[PDB]
Scaffold this active site. Structure first.
Site, PDB file in Angstrom:
ATOM      1  CG  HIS A  40       5.499  47.851  48.666  1.00 32.69           C
ATOM      2  ND1 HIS A  40       4.440  47.654  49.538  1.00 32.69           N
ATOM      3  CD2 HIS A  40       6.126  48.993  49.080  1.00 32.69           C
ATOM      4  CE1 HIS A  40       4.463  48.598  50.469  1.00 32.69           C
ATOM      5  NE2 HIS A  40       5.456  49.444  50.190  1.00 32.69           N
ATOM      6  CB  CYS A  94       3.860  52.481  50.862  1.00 34.80           C
ATOM      7  SG  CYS A  94       5.215  52.171  52.002  1.00 34.80           S
ATOM      8  CG  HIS A 138       1.499  44.981  49.521  1.00 37.15           C
ATOM      9  ND1 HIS A 138       2.331  45.897  50.121  1.00 37.15           N
ATOM     10  CD2 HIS A 138       0.648  44.539  50.501  1.00 37.15           C
ATOM     11  CE1 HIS A 138       2.038  45.977  51.420  1.00 37.15           C
ATOM     12  NE2 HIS A 138       1.015  45.175  51.670  1.00 37.15           N
TER      13      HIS A 138
HETATM   14  O1  LIG Z   1       2.130  52.813  59.309  1.00 36.37           O
HETATM   15  C1  LIG Z   1       2.891  51.884  59.008  1.00 36.37           C
HETATM   16  O2  LIG Z   1       4.218  52.135  58.881  1.00 36.37           O
HETATM   17  C2  LIG Z   1       2.372  50.465  58.663  1.00 36.37           C
HETATM   18  N1  LIG Z   1       0.958  50.617  58.188  1.00 36.37           N
HETATM   19  C3  LIG Z   1      -0.074  50.508  59.253  1.00 36.37           C
HETATM   20  C4  LIG Z   1       0.123  49.090  59.864  1.00 36.37           C
HETATM   21  C5  LIG Z   1       0.427  48.939  61.244  1.00 36.37           C
HETATM   22  C6  LIG Z   1       0.609  47.661  61.803  1.00 36.37           C
HETATM   23  C7  LIG Z   1       0.485  46.531  60.964  1.00 36.37           C
HETATM   24  C8  LIG Z   1       0.171  46.683  59.597  1.00 36.37           C
HETATM   25  C9  LIG Z   1      -0.009  47.957  59.043  1.00 36.37           C
HETATM   26  C10 LIG Z   1       0.633  50.755  56.907  1.00 36.37           C
HETATM   27  O3  LIG Z   1      -0.525  50.826  56.524  1.00 36.37           O
HETATM   28  C11 LIG Z   1       1.854  50.633  55.889  1.00 36.37           C
HETATM   29  N2  LIG Z   1       2.421  49.439  55.595  1.00 36.37           N
HETATM   30  C12 LIG Z   1       3.438  49.690  54.724  1.00 36.37           C
HETATM   31  C13 LIG Z   1       4.274  48.692  54.210  1.00 36.37           C
HETATM   32  C14 LIG Z   1       3.825  47.353  54.067  1.00 36.37           C
HETATM   33  C15 LIG Z   1       4.692  46.386  53.590  1.00 36.37           C
HETATM   34  C16 LIG Z   1       6.037  46.687  53.254  1.00 36.37           C
HETATM   35  C17 LIG Z   1       6.461  48.021  53.430  1.00 36.37           C
HETATM   36  C18 LIG Z   1       5.607  49.006  53.906  1.00 36.37           C
HETATM   37  N3  LIG Z   1       3.516  51.044  54.507  1.00 36.37           N
HETATM   38  C19 LIG Z   1       2.560  51.616  55.223  1.00 36.37           C
HETATM   39  C20 LIG Z   1       2.339  53.137  55.271  1.00 36.37           C
HETATM   40  O4  LIG Z   1       1.325  53.609  55.822  1.00 36.37           O
HETATM   41  O5  LIG Z   1       3.204  53.870  54.751  1.00 36.37           O
END
Ligand SMILES: O=C(O)CN(Cc1ccccc1)C(=O)c1nc(-c2ccccc2)[nH]c1C(=O)O
Length: 144
Positions: A40, A94, A138
């Site tokens: 993604h 991400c 995304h």
């Molecule tokens: O820090 C994390 O690992 C997840 N977060 C913050 C978060 C925390 C709880 C719920 C949703 C989002 C993100 O915003 C995030 N989401 C993703 C993500 C979303 C969907 C699929 C894979 C990765 N990556 C990230 C990142 O910082 O790197």
């Protein structure tokens, strides 16, 4: 038609096209595994859960500005002007950006639900339109 697909009519041309309300994909031509593999590209905005990334310590763009970025990346990928891997590496908020956005294989019950549903509704090789979650917006490419 397969899960999520509906027939629609184009605003400019009047021609039939197909819209998937689960992936937000749209295409001109007429269109479940235990596990899928996806990459993604994530564009965060000021209302994301964690408005920070390797690219930018404080992410301040609005959700509308993020969606505009997403739509521009979709257009470049669909035109073949840029490939998905390259825009993910460069522009995804991400941490998977350093792996060309590749997340590896996952099954249902692991991802945020709008991300999972889109991932499992894509065909191998198929790319989503903009998919919204609390992480941000995304583009999903299903690779297996
Ligand atoms: O820090 C994390 O690992 C997840 N977060 C913050 C978060 C925390 C709880 C719920 C949703 C989002 C993100 O915003 C995030 N989401 C993703 C993500 C979303 C969907 C699929 C894979 C990765 N990556 C990230 C990142 O910082 O790197």
């Amino acid at each position: 038609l397969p899960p999520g697909w509906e027939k629609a009519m184009s605003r400019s041309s009047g021609r039939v096209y197909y819209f998937n309300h689960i992936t937000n994909a749209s295409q001109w031509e007429r269109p479940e595994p235990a596990r899928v593999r996806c990459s993604h590209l994530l564009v965060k905005h000021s209302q994301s859960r964690r408005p920070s990334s390797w690219r930018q310590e404080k992410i301040t763009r609005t959700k509308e500005e993020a969606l505009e970025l997403i739509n521009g990346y979709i257009q470049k990928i669909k035109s073949g002007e840029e490939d998905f891997e390259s825009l993910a590496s460069q522009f995804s908020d991400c941490s998977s950006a350093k792996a060309r956005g590749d997340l590896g294989a996952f099954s249902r019950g692991q991802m945020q639900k709008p991300f999972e549903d889109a991932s499992f509704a894509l065909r191998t090789g198929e790319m989503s339109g903009p998919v919204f979650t609390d992480s941000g917006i995304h583009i999903i490419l299903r690779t297996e």
